[PDB]
């Protein structure tokens, strides 16, 4: 079998899940448009009752200039004018753990 679910059996599985989520449906028919309007009013769902979305839309100068001038030829501070993930330390810890485990074997 290899995998938990075989792709060729996916649809069947899905079908069964649906049977367990919606055991009851509203199957009684209506005789005219007024009854359909009433039924649509009665079966409204909050998650599907939003309004349509909105349309897409589009002195300190001297101090800033002096600051920019004073940051000339700066490798890192100039670029800015910061999320530490500690990747290197975690890597070092993993390497140390692996080396200690290897040493313990001998």
């Amino acid at each position: 079998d290899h995998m938990e679910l075989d792709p060729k059996n996916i649809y069947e599985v899905e079908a069964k899940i649906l049977l367990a989520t919606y055991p009851k449906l509203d199957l009684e028919p209506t005789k005219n448009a007024e009854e359909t309007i009433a039924k649509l009013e009665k079966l409204a769902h909050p998650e599907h009752s939003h309004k349509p979305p909105e349309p897409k839309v589009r002195d300190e100068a001297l101090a800033a200039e002096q600051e920019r001038y004073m940051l000339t030829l700066d490798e890192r501070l100039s670029s800015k004018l910061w999320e530490p993930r500690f990747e290197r330390f975690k890597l070092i810890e993993n390497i140390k753990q692996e080396h200690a485990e290897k040493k313990e074997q001998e």
Binding site: E4, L5, N9, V13, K16, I17, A20
Partner: peptide, 7 residues
């Protein structure tokens, strides 16, 4: 056994 998977 699809029944077991669903359960």
């Amino acid at each position: 056994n699809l029944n077991q998977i669903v359960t």
